[PDB]
């Protein structure tokens, strides 16, 4: 059985920075370090950090006065930021710079009292954080997930309207939403394309190439990782069986029995050791040396804040 590896795969720059922020805080201040929400959506990274003394909480009311609190890569609303500020907390912000960039635009529209529409998945922490940058009652902030949501949205002033997106969406489905937004609201303003980040766009391009060759695609990532689930969905829509798995223990023998080519990739929040264990298990199941596909080069690094070197 041939094993192919997608390229790029695995950690993005914002995840590598966010995990470093927590590790460095642990190293400098000791346990406990509180983290609002899973720092990234990966069970193995979060369980690990928990074992080292990070305590993951959903609400600031769970954190003791005097504590150090880190905000996760996905970002937080101004309400959450203000609640930490008003509390006795020392805060470090692991929000990825590419999320913060969207936040700055939503805050700008808020100050102007002009309405904004976010394309994103309800309930996801990045969407809570981004919607939570808008607070002007004279304007409005609306969420759409699909073209049907667009066809039902009414706004107060469609002449002054802008849109933003979550960073980890499907590139193809978001294109359909924007096409519907521009049909319904021809004066809407946005970025040139969307706010989907380079790592999400690149891993979906890489999974498309992988799926063209492989019969089955395994995506290493946790169930709550949006970007990871997009990679599995992309391969399934190309007619390949694709499974989102946390680790090698999840691989069911029947998924690869009699398969000639299996592809492996990993979401932006999944560490490379999990991919190496998955390859080792595919080799038990008859796979050869893993062959890396050629891929788009990534070169971006985001440094930790100077206070945490």
Ligand X SMILES: C#CCOP(=O)(O)OP(=O)(O)O
Shortest distance (Å) from residue 100 CB to ligand X: 12
In the bound state with ligand X, the residue whose beta carbon lies nearer, of 110 and 269, is: 269
261 in a known ligand binding site: no
Query: Considering the rule CB under 6 A, would residue 41 count as an interface residue with ligand X?
Result: yes
Query: Considering the rule CB under 6 A, would residue 265 count as an interface residue with ligand SF4?
Result: no
185-204 residues in contact with ligand SF4 (CB under 6 A) are 197, 199-200
Q: Tokens in use for 107?
A: 């805050």
Q: Tell which residue, 221, 237, 98, has the closest CA to residue 166.
A: 98
Task: Supply the DSSP string of 169-224, one letter for each residue.
Answer: S-HHHHHHHHHHHHHH-TT-B--SS-S--HHHHHHHHHHHHHHHH-SEEEEE--TT
Is 159 among the catalytic positions?
Answer: no
Shortest distance (Å) from residue 16 CB to ligand X: 10
Stretch 25-64: interaction string toward ligand SF4, x if CB under 6 A: ----------------------------------------
Q: How far apart are CA 207 and CA 223, in angstroms?
A: 18
Owner of token pair 């959506």: 41
SS (HEC) of 46-70: HHHHHHCCEEEECCHHHCCCCCEEE
Query: Considering the rule CB under 6 A, would residue 13 count as an interface residue with ligand SF4?
Result: yes
Q: Tokens in use for 91?
A: 């805060």
Q: Which residues are annotated as a binding site?
A: 12, 41, 74, 96, 124, 167, 197, 225-227, 269
Active-site positions read 126
Binding site for ligand X (CB under 6 A): 14-15, 40-41, 73-74, 96, 126, 168, 225-228, 267-269
């Amino acid at each position: 059985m041939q094993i192919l590896l997608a390229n790029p795969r695995g950690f993005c720059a914002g995840v590598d920075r966010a995990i470093s922020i927590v590790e460095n805080a642990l190293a400098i201040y000791g346990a406990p370090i509180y983290v609002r929400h899973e720092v990234v959506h990966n069970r193995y990274v979060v369980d690990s950090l928990r074992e080292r003394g990070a305590i993951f909480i959903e609400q600031i009311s769970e954190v003791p006065d005097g504590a150090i609190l880190i905000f996760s890569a996905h970002g937080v609303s101004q309400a959450v930021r203000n609640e930490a500020k008003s509390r006795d907390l020392t805060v470090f912000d692991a929000t990825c710079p590419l999320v913060t960039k969207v936040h700055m635009e939503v805050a700008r529209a808020s100050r102007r009292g002009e309405e904004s529409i976010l394309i994103g998945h309800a309930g996801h922490p990045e969407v809570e954080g981004t919607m939570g940058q808008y607070s002007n009652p004279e304007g409005g902030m609306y969420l759409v997930e699909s073209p049907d949501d667009v066809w039902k949205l009414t706004v107060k002033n469609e002449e002054k309207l802008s849109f933003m997106t979550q960073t980890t969406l499907s590139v193809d489905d978001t294109s359909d939403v924007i096409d519907a937004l521009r049909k319904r609201f021809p004066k809407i303003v946005g970025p040139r394309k969307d706010d989907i980040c380079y790592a999400t766009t690149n891993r979906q391009e890489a999974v498309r190439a992988l799926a063209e060759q492989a019969e089955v695609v395994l995506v290493v990532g946790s169930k709550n990782s949006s970007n990871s689930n997009r990679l599995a969905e992309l391969a399934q829509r190309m007619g390949k069986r694709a499974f989102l798995i946390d680790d090698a223990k999840d691989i069911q023998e029947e998924w690869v029995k009699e398969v000639k080519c299996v592809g492996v990739t990993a979401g932006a929040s999944a560490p490379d050791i999990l991919v190496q264990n998955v390859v080792a298990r595919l080799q038990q199941l008859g796979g050869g040396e893993a062959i890396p596909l050629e891929g788009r080069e990534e070169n971006i690094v985001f440094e930790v804040p100077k206070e945490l070197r």
